[PDB]
Amino acid sequence: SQQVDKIKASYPLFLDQDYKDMLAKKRDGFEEKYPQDKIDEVFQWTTTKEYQELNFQREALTVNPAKACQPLGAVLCALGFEKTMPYVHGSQGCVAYFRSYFNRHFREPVSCVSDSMTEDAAVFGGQQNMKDGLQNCKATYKPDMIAVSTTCMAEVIGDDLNAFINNSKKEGFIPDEFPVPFAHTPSFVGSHVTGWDNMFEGIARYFTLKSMDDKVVGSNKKINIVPGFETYLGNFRVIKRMLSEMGVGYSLLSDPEEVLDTPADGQFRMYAGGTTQEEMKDAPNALNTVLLQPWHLEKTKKFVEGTWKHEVPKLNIPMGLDWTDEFLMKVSEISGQPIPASLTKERGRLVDMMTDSHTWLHGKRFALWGDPDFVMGLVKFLLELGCEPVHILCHNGNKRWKKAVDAILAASPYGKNATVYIGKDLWHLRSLVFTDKPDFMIGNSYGKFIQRDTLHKGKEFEVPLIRIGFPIFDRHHLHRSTTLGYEGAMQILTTLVNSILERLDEETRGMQATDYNHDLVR
Amino acid sequence: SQQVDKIKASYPLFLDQDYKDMLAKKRDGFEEKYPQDKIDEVFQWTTTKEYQELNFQREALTVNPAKACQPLGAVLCALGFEKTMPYVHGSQGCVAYFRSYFNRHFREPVSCVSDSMTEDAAVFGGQQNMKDGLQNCKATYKPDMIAVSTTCMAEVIGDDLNAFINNSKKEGFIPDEFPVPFAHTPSFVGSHVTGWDNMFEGIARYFTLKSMDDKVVGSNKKINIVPGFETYLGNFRVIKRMLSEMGVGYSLLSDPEEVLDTPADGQFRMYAGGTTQEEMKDAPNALNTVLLQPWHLEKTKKFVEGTWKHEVPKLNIPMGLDWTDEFLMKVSEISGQPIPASLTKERGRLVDMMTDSHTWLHGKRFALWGDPDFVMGLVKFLLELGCEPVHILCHNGNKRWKKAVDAILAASPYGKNATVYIGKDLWHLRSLVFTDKPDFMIGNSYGKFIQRDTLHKGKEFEVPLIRIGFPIFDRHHLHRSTTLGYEGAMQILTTLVNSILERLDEETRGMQATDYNHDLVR
Amino acid sequence: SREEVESLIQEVLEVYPEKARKDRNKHLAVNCIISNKKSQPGLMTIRGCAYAGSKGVVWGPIKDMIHISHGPVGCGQYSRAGRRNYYIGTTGVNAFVTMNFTSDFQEKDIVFGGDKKLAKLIDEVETLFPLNKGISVQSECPIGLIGDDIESVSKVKGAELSKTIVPVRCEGFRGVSQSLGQHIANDAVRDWVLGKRDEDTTFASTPYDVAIIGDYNIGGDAWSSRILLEEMGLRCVAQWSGDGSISEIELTPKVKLNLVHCYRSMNYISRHMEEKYGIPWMEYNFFGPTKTIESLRAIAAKFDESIQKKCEEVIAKYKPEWEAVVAKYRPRLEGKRVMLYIGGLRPRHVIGAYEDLGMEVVGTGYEFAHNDDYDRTMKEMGDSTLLYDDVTGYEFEEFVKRIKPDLIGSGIKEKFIFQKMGIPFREMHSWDYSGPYHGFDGFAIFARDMDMTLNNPCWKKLQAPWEA
Amino acid sequence: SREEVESLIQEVLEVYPEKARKDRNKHLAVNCIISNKKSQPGLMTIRGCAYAGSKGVVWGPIKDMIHISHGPVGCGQYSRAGRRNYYIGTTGVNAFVTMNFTSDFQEKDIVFGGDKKLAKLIDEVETLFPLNKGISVQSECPIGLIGDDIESVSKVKGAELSKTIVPVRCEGFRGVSQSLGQHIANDAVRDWVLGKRDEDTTFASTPYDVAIIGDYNIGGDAWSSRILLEEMGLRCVAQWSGDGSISEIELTPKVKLNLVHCYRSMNYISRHMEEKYGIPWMEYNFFGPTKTIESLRAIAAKFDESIQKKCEEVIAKYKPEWEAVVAKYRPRLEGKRVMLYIGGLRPRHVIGAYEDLGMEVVGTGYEFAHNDDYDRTMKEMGDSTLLYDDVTGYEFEEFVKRIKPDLIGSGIKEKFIFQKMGIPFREMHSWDYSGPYHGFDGFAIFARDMDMTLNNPCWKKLQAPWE
């Protein structure tokens, strides 16, 4: 049943008695469900220290990964360029998944094509798919550039992307100097961040490699900024803002902030903004290149240092107070531009916010996960706030990264109870938040299932999620926010302190039980 | 007891058994407490429709007011001017309260003085307090201006501010053309918004009234913007930003955004920024004056139209889509400046956000309170989102305001279940959210006590608070946000949709009970 | 106008190269068309792969089994909890639908083969999730290409542990769409699960045993179907895939009738259970009053008079309820034109429900459907309305531009495109996180959802007042 | 350093006019001083009014009574839930501390008088909040100036309804600080509440009855005191104001001893209960181990050997616990210099606790305290340390600038000033939303809190690496 003035969606409709009895009849008659007392027993075993030991002995089974595959990254890299079609040579199912994955995070159109390699291509190569694929794409969607990457199918059968693209230009399927940069992006090597790096390095080689003798380092007086896999509109926007505040000439290489936020005004814009091909060709003339997320931009670093002959600064991700300072100061001495009063003030307002909030932040324990640079910048900023980053998880982290983060933990008294875990996943982390319960978790939406697992043990054991990362699918418009700079540090500080105060109000909202501490002023 | 590695503050320390028994012994031995069963009975009566009828028959008793007194406003008005000491002639207890009240909202220094009128002044006037008060203040705190208002004590015994200030100039306590604008701000007439208006009108008269024959309307080619009682840093900042985006010459008259947000850099800055005296003297030369919050700026409107001869546009508060449009278009035709592509885009991104979020917002029921212009702009924007503003409370609203809001409710299908309540307070509203339960409340921190009252009845009856307003004392740094413009509409839309989705996750976080709707993607 | 439509198709197709133009002309019709082959390269097909058809729709929803996306990390991630195939359970203990179990292939596994890694993965699954009642291993592309034999691993390990381990060779390169993956998944149930209780005679059947076949309980869809069928006196032994257990699948050979909702994904096994076990099967439609009523009457006609009486009693109970829904919402939606695009059942099936709210469906089309689906569509759609098979991104944008519909009902990769164009949009896959849309009190939810989006305030606001 | 301090005072005072200079010189001393008179006009005094002293500190905390801020809307708002005087109850039903009941004066009430409006307000209070056990009517400035007689209204209405209605003439113009309001509030309890059970002999007393007088349970402060006194065998009949009920106040004439924590706010009624009822009273200090221990020993010495034994057992139980606190935090805070400024007890009382963490209090001062508080302070403070009575905003800023302390402990109107100067700050009023700070469990929180703020990472980053 249904009352037409108060219509019930799935929740709370299946809580009505005739539904509740119906599901009870289904379970009992046909499911051969385990006894509830046994389900409880096994649940309580999943929370133990004994289970956690067996959980970290896993060698073959990954459960609830906190990473994606290489071509996802290559698409986001590609969307950052002017009137560019991301194109992933291989299987079409992949492209439907990368588009959906990003559609749900940004709540926007994500344009990307496939050349639809079937079984026939497996035995005879995807060569004709590259030829037809690029021709149809060029004509149907009118792109000034097409950036090709690959899915596992195309990688396992070893399609030479380079040859396939050169033969489609020769046979006249696409114009001979129609831009088709490529990258082999195998899903089984690394992760999505590796695919962003590979794609960028491929586009940089396409506009640069065969034209270097013409280039002089520093002649355009600009600094190139390579963003990395970035899924916050506010991070692209804040880097630009601050550089413009300083009056620093820059070139953001791969900039998707316009395509990923077009206006609803009666028309769909497949393409919008992005880094021009002219900025990519003139990029060797920059004074230098800054890598905003260096731990997943290693291939790019070797190409900009090796072919462009730039002396890439040893800068961490500009997250938190110290690393945003270090960033602005490097930018100040490369460009010779002084840091304006506005950024010196914004730094001071951030430090003011830190001093106003430290009593609630101090000693707070966090479990957190994400991509390598995001995780170390979040760890640094938590140490600056006087918080303890107890469980640091980075599934796609490497050994050198782990050593760089254990080193920054070692230098702080707030990193004494902290451990960095690389190659481990969210089922691993589900155990660490049970056996060494933190106060909160900072992570993506996949963390909501860890939070309901901790509430099932009980309220005292519940560890709330604070959504900062990728993907955030269960909340609206948080892709618009900022995690970098002073701006970004102000937003994270306000989220961390207010999540804490929210949980205190929740724990003290009980009449004559706990509300003696339900303070008006905090 | 106490474990030194895990120290417990009031919560959860008094939940320990020896404390719990101790309090039980106190209650039973000496409190002569009502039987718990009787407390429950009376609580359930406070939630009924019968109680609500008796609650609205109140003529003499105000419980939990949603307004403050006139001089509070006058201080915030005054802080907006360059190197100005707010000074409140009368009692000193007042000034300790206005300073504290604002200190806790902004988490900043709030500088303001009193001339400490005692009982002696009651029988012989506060004349000497004005003389000494202004002299000491001028010399100790070095202000370029002192803006005098009054507390009830000084109003009831009828101290002539004007005479008292003229006699202190004559006797040589302060220089003869040291700026001392004044306003009689009686706590028993109107509210804090009335005191902002009175103060502004007094400062405008001080720099203008005796020098009008020199002034030509439109000669400086600027538009004056009077903000009103404004306690969000982002509202001052967004008005300025948009006007500068348009390349519109403006003069924000009363601008406290710098004093209320100075940097923590090793020094305290008593004064910072603000509207110069030169902008106030040259203000009649503006093309016009826009009143951002017109329903509490009536005295000011009469002075700018009557003495400055400006034709003040009939503009509502620029909140929501329609009224920010109407604002920019008036500014476009007064200044003759076109609306730039950047604001047309920002409008489109806001409409895009509206279309992405409407499924969660539609039909959502709200109880809300606040100052008159804030409430009608929030009501308009909720109607634009497809939400129902069911209980509209404005304690300091007047009859004409109520008719203007019933008129905007009448024009929408989402205002059919809505009622506007003026002169009523938060104990009145506590009943309306019990008997005609909304989904959420949008209001200040005093609303947290309504939320714990609704949870006491039960979880099904709980109405969550969404903190938008003044004062917000139990959360950190929300005074930095924005409620005006497209920016402001984007922030409210994101808070409203995410509060809704948070509550859905909370209601569906129960294992094998309600988690069948604990969706990853929403 | 049939010539406006005829001329439209032709115009859109001129932007193509030649073999694209010829092939797409065959896949666009005014209501005669060819269907289910390949997608044309570089044209932004909305279609998924055979893996999505197997793991995403048939296997994934089976509650008390652990499904292993065998391959790299991508597929398992993107498909983790993307489809709302609802279930009752304790996830991670006895139920596992929203978790991602993967073999996470690295280069050593590609080079050497992933079968020893799979064998150890199965043991790990058994020590950490003891209460699973079975395991599937869903092959992603690499598995078939590198020549792994997951069948060997499944038999040796399945015997060793006395557990059902189903190998599914649903590699995304296989087939042309999600469709083949559905087929591969049906045959995987036939060969490794359905026949398990052919010896067992201890299930106490009744004359009224039935099974819901091909309802994946999107937003509770199957629960809203089942309640109605059981109020009518019938007993639902099984629910296929949506909130389904392995023992219900194993028990489905004991029913008297199989009720096929989704024909494209479940016709294969329905034909097999009628061959091997003699169980008759029928297609029904639980979208909107009209269709739920004719379906309830037709299912009841297969039994005796006591089920036909209970049928008419059930129709009588819900008749005040759906009549209030049309009384409220049909005035609000009358004459509004809907353009649709989903996968293999819904393009045809929801039309009834739109018509019960006085809406006209002016265009519909399938991603991965066959010709027997397009023969079923013909009858449901009106004259001169547009049909489109495996529509390209370009094409759907160009058809909407011209046709100017009041509502578009498609997937997530289409949603934000049309909202930017000012066209109201409802997802007809995930139901836009709403639903159930099946039965009578899913019609209530359907109807208010089309109304809230079509007559929403935001649509009148897409142009700035200074642009006019 | 006594001449540096002597010279400091003189330098700060040169920015003043003449009668300000003369008056403020009298209110600044190197450890005699004059105290408790008026504030000088226009000098940004930190002091509140007599209303704050009555409604805010004495009356407001009384749990099962409704307190009416009689006047305009301001006072009741600014003081609504500003002080954390903790209680157990069901607010709006039987308990009311965090609610704002006000008569909200409009111009008709100023012109005609607010006594008929008060009479109807009392009836409304009775129909809507039936379970209140009494009503106070806290006068704001206008009430006394317009010549209202709230006493008449209280007697006629109190008789009519057989309910205790206390009129308190605590108008903010009255007195020079919050101090007079405390006095007015003590006399208001004396005249309208305390004597109610003088006839009643049915309370079964014991030789160990005591009352906590002047602990306002800031953050649970009184609860942390009470537990210790009751573990020592004593029975706490009353808690004055903090989590206090009206019947506990009415029962306080039945105790054997009154334990005065806050002397400045409760000495008045303590002297009266010793005159009228013969109940002896004593001052104690429950800030830090040293002081809680000497206090527990001194209170126990007023009774027999079984309370002195229980005293030593209680000292023994908590001794491992506070020794772990000093072992953890005293290494972290040793030799750090603290400058203080609160109102009328805490400037003197918390010194002990700071010294137990090896901290030196180099400056302290009171807002509204009298000379008998400054005679008590002398002994606690060291040589050549700075004393300041009713310090001006200018003065406190200038003293800190020079003296350069490691920690400042003051109120909310001071907090954000010093944090901008790079000086660590702890509120010594609201405890910065932490507490309890009384007793042994309170020492652990106090010590945790001075540490978290003085050695916070943020203080090393007040300056930009480029300037």
Ligand code: CFM
């Ligand atoms: S697109 Fe159904 S044949 Fe299959 S996920 Fe949707 S129109 Fe599928 S009805 Fe079903 S629950 Fe589906 S909505 Fe057949 S199961 S491969 Mo995308």
Ligand code: CFM
């Ligand atoms: S400023 Fe206490 S004499 Fe009074 S509110 Fe604080 S130093 Fe008061 S100890 Fe007390 S709980 Fe106080 S902290 Fe006497 S009650 S008028 Mo502001």
Ligand SMILES: [Ca+2]
């Ligand atoms: Ca969007």
Ligand SMILES: [Ca+2]
């Ligand atoms: Ca601050």
